[PDB]
Structure formats: C-alpha cells, structure tokens
C-alpha cells in the first residue's frame, strides 16, 4: 500500500487549495468536487527543487480494509482528452507534458507532470486536476473514501515530498462539504 505520510523533506514541501464546483475543507482535509470539474491543487515549497523534479498524484482507498484495492473509474464512467487513459480516475488539465502510467508490480494508475515554477501572479504553482468518477459509483468508488496522494519526485522517482487530502467527489460538492462539517461539530 502507498504511503501517505506527510514528509516536507528537503525542499519544504506541502499543499495548498483555494454553484461550487470544487471546495476544500481545512477542518476535514477534504476536497470535495463535481465529475470532471477543474481542482486546482497548489504545490508550496520552501526552496526550488532541483531540474527534472516531477509531481505525481495518485488515488489510493482510505479505509485500512480496503487500502490494498486499486482506486479505478466504474465501467460506466470509462466511456475524454485522448490522453488520460479510461480507467484512470484523476487526470491532469492544461498540461502538455502529462504522463499517464500504470504501476507494472501494483496494477495502481498515477499520472505525473513536470514540476514547474509559480505561474505568473502566483507564490505556488498550481495544477488542475479532474476526477472520472463519483464516489457513489457502483463498481468503482462504491461510497469508499478515497484520498489522493501528492509526491515530488526526482527524476529517477525517488522521493522528495508527499502530501495527501481525501476526496469526494460528488454532485453537491459545497453542501456535502457543510453537512460534513457540521455533523464533525456536532
Ligand atoms: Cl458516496
Ligand atoms: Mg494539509
Ligand atoms: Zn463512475
């Protein structure tokens, strides 16, 4: 099962987030968003990595029972860019330079793009991702929380900083976001 212990490391590295399409919850370390919908996930770092880091996001099941299954979209939801492979469920948009892999020993898809320097206007850089799938989905999800998991990587792979956040995704991602909330106030 991948890790998802959050390591800085060297370069100080860890996330940030911004009709609600896509909303995050501090309290709950929680993103919720609708199918298909734009999640700009911020990547913050102390120091610059070094050239030919890349950032990887991957989905794996929260639930220690089912840690060991592989997040994947529902038949249903497999039929697109011509890029993200049909079972995968998160891809990346508006990135030219999206690589979508499957792990040969695990059967755990991840997609990985380049890490790049703030965008204009902006102390992070920011990448936008979509999830394939509800988490509801019968033969996908199945209603299993799922969490996505960050990596910065060096070119060979190694690791140099992991981050993570649960996901739902959902048709009311704003008021699955309060009902949550208030039912962990209450
Ligand atoms: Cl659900
Ligand atoms: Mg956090
Ligand atoms: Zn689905």
Same mark, same amino acid.
């Given at each position: 099962?991948? $890790?998802?212990?959050?390591?800085?490391?060297? #370069? +100080?590295?860890?996330?940030?987030?911004?009709?609600?399409?896509?909303?995050?919850?501090?309290?709950? /370390?929680?993103?919720?968003?609708?199918?298909?919908?734009?999640?700009?996930?911020?990547?913050?770092?102390?120091?610059?990595?070094?050239?030919?880091?890349?950032?990887?996001?991957?989905?794996?099941?929260?639930? $220690?029972?089912?840690?060991?299954?592989?997040?994947?979209?529902?038949?249903?939801?497999?039929?697109?860019?011509?890029?993200?492979?049909?079972?995968?469920?998160?891809?990346?948009?508006?990135?030219?330079?999206?690589? #979508?892999?499957?792990?040969?020993?695990?059967?755990?898809?991840?997609?990985?793009?380049?890490?790049?320097?703030?965008?204009? +206007?902006?102390?992070?850089?920011?990448?936008?991702? /979509? #999830?394939?799938?509800?988490?509801?989905?019968?033969?996908?999800? /199945?209603?299993?929380?799922?969490?996505?998991?960050?990596?910065?990587?060096?070119?060979?792979?190694?690791?140099?900083?992991?981050?993570?956040?649960?996901?739902?995704?959902?048709?009311?991602?704003?008021?699955?976001?309060?009902?949550?909330?208030?039912?962990?106030?209450?």
């Amino acid at each position: 099962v991948p $890790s998802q212990k959050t390591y800085q490391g060297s #370069y +100080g590295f860890r996330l940030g987030f911004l009709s609600v399409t896509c909303t995050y919850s501090p309290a709950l /370390n929680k993103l919720f968003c609708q199918l298909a919908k734009t999640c700009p996930v911020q990547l913050w770092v102390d120091s610059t990595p070094p050239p030919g880091t890349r950032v990887r996001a991957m989905a794996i099941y929260k639930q $220690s029972q089912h840690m060991t299954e592989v997040v994947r979209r529902c038949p249903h939801h497999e039929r697109s860019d011509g890029l993200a492979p049909p079972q995968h469920l998160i891809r990346v948009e508006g990135n030219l330079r999206a690589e #979508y892999l499957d792990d040969r020993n695990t059967f755990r898809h991840s997609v990985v793009v380049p890490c790049e320097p703030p965008e204009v +206007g902006s102390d992070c850089t920011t990448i936008h991702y /979509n #999830y394939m799938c509800y988490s509801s989905c019968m033969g996908g999800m /199945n209603r299993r929380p799922i969490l996505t998991i960050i990596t910065l990587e060096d070119s060979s792979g190694n690791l140099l900083g992991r981050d993570s956040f649960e996901v739902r995704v959902c048709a009311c991602p704003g008021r699955d976001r309060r009902t949550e909330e208030e039912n962990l106030r209450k």
